[PDB]
C-alpha cells in the first residue's frame, strides 16, 4: 500500500532535519497516520476549489489557496 511508500528512511530523514537524535520504532507508523490526516485535510479543500472552478485538474493555486485557509500559507507557487 502507498502509505508505506513513505518509507522509514524518508521519515528518518525528515525528523533528522528536525534535529531528532534517536527514534523509537513506532514513530514510523504514527508519522504515517499524521501525514495522511495532514494530506486529506489539505487535498480536500484543494479539490473543493477545483470542483468550484469546474476543472478535473488540481492546480498549484488550488493547493496554495487551501494551504492558506488554515494558517499554513505557502510561498513559491504563484499567489
Amino acid at each position: 500500500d502507498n502509505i508505506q511508500g513513505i518509507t522509514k528512511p524518508a521519515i528518518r530523514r525528515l525528523a533528522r532535519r528536525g534535529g531528532v537524535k534517536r527514534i523509537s520504532g513506532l514513530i514510523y507508523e504514527e508519522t504515517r497516520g499524521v501525514l495522511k490526516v495532514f494530506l486529506e485535510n489539505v487535498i480536500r479543500d484543494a479539490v473543493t476549489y477545483t470542483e468550484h472552478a469546474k476543472r478535473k485538474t488540481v492546480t498549484a493555486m488550488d493547493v496554495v489557496y487551501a494551504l492558506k485557509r488554515q494558517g499554513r500559507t505557502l510561498y513559491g507557487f504563484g499567489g
Binding site: D45, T48, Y49, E51, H52, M61, Y65, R69
Partner: protein, 93 residues
C-alpha cells in the same frame, strides 16, 4: 438603533423547544454566533469569487464556501437546507 438577530433566534428557539427561554446574556452570544458565522462564510465566498475572476457571489459560491468552512455532517445538512430554501424560493414567483 442597533439591529440584532435576537427575535429570529427566539422564533427558532420556540421551534425546537417550545417551553424553553434564553437569558439576555445567552442571546447576546447567539447573536455573536450568527454574526461570526455570517462573516466567515461571506468572506470565504468573497475570496472564492476573486479566485475565479467572478463579480457576483451567488448561491453557488456561498455553498462551496460552506463546504470549506463547516465540518463533516454539518456541511451536509447545511448544504441541504441551503439547496432547499433556494429551490423553494426559486419556484415562488
Amino acid at each position: 438603533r442597533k439591529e440584532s438577530y435576537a427575535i429570529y433566534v427566539y422564533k427558532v428557539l420556540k421551534q425546537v423547544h417550545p417551553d424553553t427561554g434564553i437569558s439576555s446574556k445567552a442571546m447576546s452570544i447567539m447573536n455573536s454566533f450568527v454574526n461570526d458565522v455570517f462573516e466567515r462564510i461571506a468572506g470565504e465566498a468573497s475570496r472564492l469569487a476573486h479566485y475565479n475572476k467572478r463579480s457576483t457571489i451567488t448561491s453557488r459560491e456561498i455553498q462551496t464556501a460552506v463546504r470549506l468552512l463547516l465540518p463533516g455532517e454539518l456541511a451536509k445538512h447545511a448544504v441541504s437546507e441551503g439547496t432547499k430554501a433556494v429551490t423553494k424560493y426559486t419556484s415562488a414567483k
